Design a protein around this ligand. Structure first.
Ligand SMILES: [Zn+2]
Length: 267
């Protein structure tokens, strides 16, 4: 099987590995980024994988050590790909670059190409199927790119805030106009002073929307938007409800577009 660290990397892998080998995701969604504590069983799965796919040590830091013992021809480390260097954007995260790389359609393409290359070397008997899969992935990516772009085009100029500084890759690519982000605990609303400052910025900068993520308590989001003119939305950067499969990455980009539009559309 191909073992991907995070769900959206699984979406990409599952397009390329379709009908060749299974794709598995290592991490449950609710422990995604940087905190997770790998179990011995997870390390076993990594070592047994046909191919491991992950962003790299500045994202899934918890798996860096486990991957040292996996041969280079059995891993794709997305942030280290030669073609990914000109695609990186400046941004707990704490590094210099935005490492939410799966939100860039161009980095997704580079990732698919890297996965395809490694699998063809590992499984030459399946080259034709792997080639067909890459062709289908790229065709869908092109079609989705066009659909999403047109759906988000009328929403340009409409300001909003987010609670997670992740979306830059997707926003820049499709021409959305974010006003910025607030650091907000998903379980506990900010204190009196900081809540005042946030609510003031929401009104002053003329935000249409503020976007939370699925793990945020509705009450925390309501406390942020209370008093302001601002509509509340939800973005899901992991596509948690989308099942792995051939069309999943395209479904993910399309869903994220729907989530932006659901809130930003109208007035
Ligand atoms: Zn993050």
């Amino acid at each position: 099987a191909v073992v991907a660290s995070l769900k959206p990397l699984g979406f990409i892998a599952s397009a390329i590995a379709d009908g060749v080998t299974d794709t598995q995701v290592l991490l449950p969604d609710g422990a995604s980024e940087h905190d997770y504590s790998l179990r011995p069983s997870d390390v076993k799965r990594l070592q047994g994988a046909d191919l491991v796919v992950w962003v790299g040590p500045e994202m899934e830091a918890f798996m860096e050590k486990s991957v040292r013992n996996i041969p280079d021809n059995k891993q794709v480390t997305i942030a280290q790909l030669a073609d990914v260097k000109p695609l990186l954007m400046k941004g707990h995260h704490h590094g210099e670059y935005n490492m939410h790389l799966w939100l860039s359609p161009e980095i997704a393409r580079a990732t698919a190409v890297a996965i395809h290359e490694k699998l063809v070397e590992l499984m030459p008997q399946s080259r034709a199927k792997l080639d067909a899969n890459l062709k289908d992935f790229e065709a869908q990516l092109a079609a989705t790119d066009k659909q999403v772009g047109n759906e988000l085009a009328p929403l340009k100029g409409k300001g909003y805030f987010v609670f997670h500084d992740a979306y830059g890759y997707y926003e820049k690519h499709y021409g959305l106009t974010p006003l910025g982000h607030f650091t907000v605990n998903p379980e506990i609303q900010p204190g009196a002073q900081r809540l005042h400052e946030i609510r003031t910025q929401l009104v002053e900068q003329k935000a249409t929307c503020v976007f939370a993520e699925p793990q945020f308590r509705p009450a925390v989001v309501e406390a942020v938007a209370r008093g302001t003119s601002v509509r509340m939305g939800t973005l899901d950067p992991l596509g948690t409800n989308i099942k792995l499969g051939k069309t999943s990455y395209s479904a993910f980009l399309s869903q994220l577009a729907n989530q932006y539009a659901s809130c930003l559309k109208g007035d």
